[PDB]
A paper describes a structure:
We demonstrate that a single amino acid substitution, F84T, akin to the H84T mutation and predicted to remove the pi–pi stacking interaction, does indeed decrease mitogenicity while preserving antiviral activity. The F84T mutation in Malay BanLec disrupts pi–pi stacking without significant changes to the overall structure of the monomer or to the dimer. F84T and WT Malay BanLec have an almost identical structure, with an RMSD of 0.424 Å between all atoms. F84T Malay BanLec similarly loses pi–pi stacking (the “mitogenic wall”), but otherwise retains a structure that is almost identical to its parent lectin. We thus conclude that F84T is less mitogenic than is WT Malay BanLec because it likely does not crosslink surface molecules as well. F84T-treated cells also incorporated less BrdU than WT Malay BanLec-treated cells, indicating that F84T is less mitogenic than WT Malay BanLec. Taken together, these studies indicate that F84T induces less proliferation of PBLs, less expression of key cytokines/chemokines from PBMCs, and perhaps less activation of CD4 + PBMCs than WT Malay BanLec, indicating that F84T is less mitogenic than WT Malay BanLec. F84T robustly reduced luciferase activity, indicating that it retained the ability to inhibit HIV infection. As H84T is known to have broad-spectrum antiviral activity, we next sought to characterize whether F84T could inhibit additional viruses that are associated with human disease and are known to express mannose-containing N-glycans on their surfaces.
A BLAST protein sequence alignment search revealed a candidate lectin from Musa acuminata ssp. malaccensis, which we term Malayasian banana lectin (Malay BanLec). Like BanLec, Malay BanLec has a β-prism-I fold characteristic of the jacalin-related lectin family. To assess binding of WT versus F84T to HIV, we conducted surface plasmon resonance analysis to determine the binding times to, and binding avidities for, the gp140 trimer, which is made up of uncleaved ectodomains of the gp160 HIV envelope glycoprotein trimer. The results show that F84T and WT Malay BanLec, which like BanLec exist as dimers with two CBS per monomer, bind with high avidity to the gp140 trimer. That is, we asked whether disruption of pi–pi stacking in a structurally related but distinct (only 63% identical at the amino acid level) jacalin-related lectin, Malaysian banana lectin (Malay BanLec), would reduce mitogenicity of the engineered lectin without abolishing antiviral activity.
Numbering used by the authors:
A (entry chain A), B (entry chain B): 3 to 142
The structure:
Amino acid sequence: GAIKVGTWGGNGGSEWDMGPAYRIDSVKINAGDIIDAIEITFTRYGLTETQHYGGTGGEPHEIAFEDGEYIMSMEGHVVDYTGLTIIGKLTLTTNRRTFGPFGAYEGTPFSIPVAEGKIAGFFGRAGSFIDAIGVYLMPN
Amino acid sequence: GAIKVGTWGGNGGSEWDMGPAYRIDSVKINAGDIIDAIEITFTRYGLTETQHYGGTGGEPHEIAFEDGEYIMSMEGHVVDYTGLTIIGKLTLTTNRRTFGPFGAYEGTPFSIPVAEGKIAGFFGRAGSFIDAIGVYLMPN
């Protein structure tokens, strides 16, 4: 019954799924040459929770969303990194700001420009890095 | 309250929007080197109609959806065609068949695999060709 778009990326790592959330509070991305990890803080059904996916490498970057600020777009690249098909670059855009690009690897681009509605969560595959990423979509 | 993802393509042509449909009955794509047109027969509020977007060129290809068949992916290329930024290649995938690829030109790829839910309508830009395309998403 959900709306899930994706994944883009490789078959490595283990499956992960945040599920949809009515409110995303903050996103923290770790990246070097590629996307090492994504960590999301969200609030739903009366509780706030943080979930970390991917490994321990890369430099951290974080965005704390304002009241009324939501994710409108995700854009990235699927690359070959040391023979592994993973996420090499990622950007998230809100109705107010651009968060990214992080990572430095380009290959096969993907983009989810949400003209109506919002990105409400993430799912994908992960190990030491983010092998694959997808998004939940919800109406505004 | 709708979920619209897109557009991918150029800034030329005129905006068009089919809106979301209860059921997509059939899709006809006209293509040669690039995507000339997309024509959809759809149903909503007990009314079936056909809408054509784009020009009169290219060869036609059609899919008539079986009962229980729905669109679960769209992918293609944004290309440079005679100096215009337009849709050069397009594929629609269902839960049963792959419709396309149509068109001969390559450029920047786009893809919207729907892991959960369906593509329920289209929007875009067009003149003599399909300058840009986007989708409506609904649950299954």
